[PDB]
Design a protein around this ligand. Structure first.
Ligand SMILES: *[C@@](O)(CO)[C@H](C[C@@H]1CCNC1=O)NC(=O)[C@H](CC(C)C)NC(=O)c1cc2c(OC)cccc2[nH]1
Ligand SMILES: *[C@@](O)(CO)[C@H](C[C@@H]1CCNC1=O)NC(=O)[C@H](CC(C)C)NC(=O)c1cc2c(OC)cccc2[nH]1
Lengths: 298, 299
């Protein structure tokens, strides 16, 4: 299995740069609105302790430089929604795809298009951790890069990049400007909560193994969801929700293995370990493939 | 530090579907030419042992159905270059990027745009293995998917997809239609030569691990180039040349770790194992980042 990103072209055509003073970052141009992190209005000194509402009072439409490449897009209005700025521009983007804004859950994967000065640099797949960080790859100038999924040519934007934590993981918002996790957009060292293993994705991995004939681990037992959840947490695994059980539905039907039967198999792996055995060639259980990712690859 | 592909937009605009009889696959549309695997002219019967010149002489321009999304492109000429078919069309692709065809060397990386029915599906990074296979992700209908690098707006196409070996690895050609490796476009079970590990790439990746605050595998030892190469070859690693040592220069300077000092770290990793420890989240020594890849991402 490869970590596979979606083709990035539909998002590349939406990337612009936004500058306010010498502060430059990336923006997302959809129809006649450009979305970007609101801290673009801050000076380095203001990022230490910002009052966004006051900083924005001193800004006008003509303080914002929006560029597609080197071509300036005239700003005709501005407003703030949570931690994102919305700049109304006088040109509707002809490359705007069909799109939606969605807020994802821990465990869901998405493609990140890393950008610098409005220019796309690379694309890779990330998973939202239970502690609401992603293990990204971002340098100075990457803020405003976005994460997305594509379903039948509709682009669902789910992430806009804001911050690197002292541990080197990354934090950001949805496209309505609401952070994932307890983080805030100020220049301070912030720490994430202890992370856990993404149980629903480990189960997807086990289904993937069964699909490919690697099924030694299937056991003879079963469990209730509540009993499994209580054991899972003693091993630093996320509890399952009803939504997790339902997104495992297609793989459960494909293999004939009930979701709760697979939970019982995983519970043995957790208690007894693997015993030098491997699954899909690895001694480690993988937790960054969603049930959808397994269906796409298999 | 993550496996990172090039943005695929410039390539997506070039992907089309090519159909001959009941055989369909993907093609690459640049200016007024569509490039695709030549076995699209074969009926599934044919693939068992094709005589390609003999089969192509018997086809007409109108046997080729080329679709760019919903629009049909009219084929007005065709020619064969090794394992690649070149269909001349009456329409120039307005989204043709600046491009070049290159043949890559083992150990080098490229981005793959996996396509089905002329529609792009996914993008990921691959390396050309020393045995000239690639460890990709390709299903039925993926033939004609391409691999590429991008350098300041210019797309260097280096791979066109043709085959999945029984072991699950993949094989293909350059855009002049010459296979990488000893493979042939006939429907047979084909084995590769014994693979080896790309040593310069593992070293580049260890430099990447240090830049992300993992220095655990480092040691106080040193080694000569030849003594390292003796141990490398014993572990089925490719030899490290002096040119490799020079390519590793910048990473050595940013970290202050001499190349042969890093070789001694790798020697210890090979001789003792990683002991249940992980490097950048991997339980295994990773060999599909080039020194260029590491610099581009870390800097
Ligand atoms: C943006 O590009 C800002 O425009 C930048 C992206 C990061 C730079 C390094 N890699 C990245 O992912 N984001 C920041 O610089 C943010 C700015 C905030 C939201 C105003 N700051 C941080 O990510 C940040 C600050 C501090 C810190 O201070 C004190 C101490 C430790 C970590 C840390 N991260
Ligand atoms: C193409 O899409 C063909 O148009 C297809 C891509 C592979 C299918 C599954 N995954 C892929 O990457 N390529 C093939 O089907 C090729 C066609 C040749 C070049 C004419 N054949 C194989 O990949 C192939 C044939 C055989 C085989 O025979 C008998 C036995 C074992 C493996 C095998 N692979």
């Amino acid at each position: 299995f490869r970590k596979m990103a979606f083709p990035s072209g539909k998002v590349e055509g939406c990337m612009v740069q936004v500058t306010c003073g010498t502060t430059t970052l990336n923006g997302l141009w959809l129809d006649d609105v450009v979305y970007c992190p609101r801290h673009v209005i801050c000076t380095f000194e203001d990022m230490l302790n910002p009052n966004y509402e006051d900083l924005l009072i001193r800004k006008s439409n003509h303080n914002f430089l929006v560029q597609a490449g080197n071509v300036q897009l005239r700003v005709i209005g501005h407003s703030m929604q949570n931690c994102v700025l919305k700049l109304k521009v006088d040109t509707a983007n002809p490359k705007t795809p069909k799109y939606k804004f969605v807020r994802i859950q821990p465990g869901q994967t998405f493609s990140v298009l890393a950008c610098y000065n409005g220019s796309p640099s690379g694309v890779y797949q990330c998973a939202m951790r239970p502690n609401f960080t992603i293990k990204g790859s971002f340098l100075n100038g990457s803020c405003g890069s976005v994460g997305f999924n594509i379903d039948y040519d509709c682009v669902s934007f789910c992430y806009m990049h804001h911050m690197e934590l002292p541990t080197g993981v990354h934090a950001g918002t949805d496209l309505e400007g609401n952070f994932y996790g307890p983080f805030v957009d100020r220049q301070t060292a912030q720490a994430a909560g202890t992370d856990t293993t993404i149980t629903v994705n480990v189960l997807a991995w086990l289904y993937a193994a069964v699909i490919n004939g690697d099924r030694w681990f299937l056991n003879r037992f079963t469990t209730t969801l509540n009993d499994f959840n209580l054991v899972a947490m003693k091993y630093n695994y996320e509890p399952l929700t009803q939504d997790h059980v339902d997104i495992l539905g297609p793989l459960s039907a494909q293999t004939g293995i009930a979701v709760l039967d697979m939970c019982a198999s995983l519970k043995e792996l957790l208690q007894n370990g693997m015993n030098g055995r491997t699954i899909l060639g690895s001694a480690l259980l993988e937790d960054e493939f969603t049930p959808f990712d397994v269906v796409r690859q298999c």
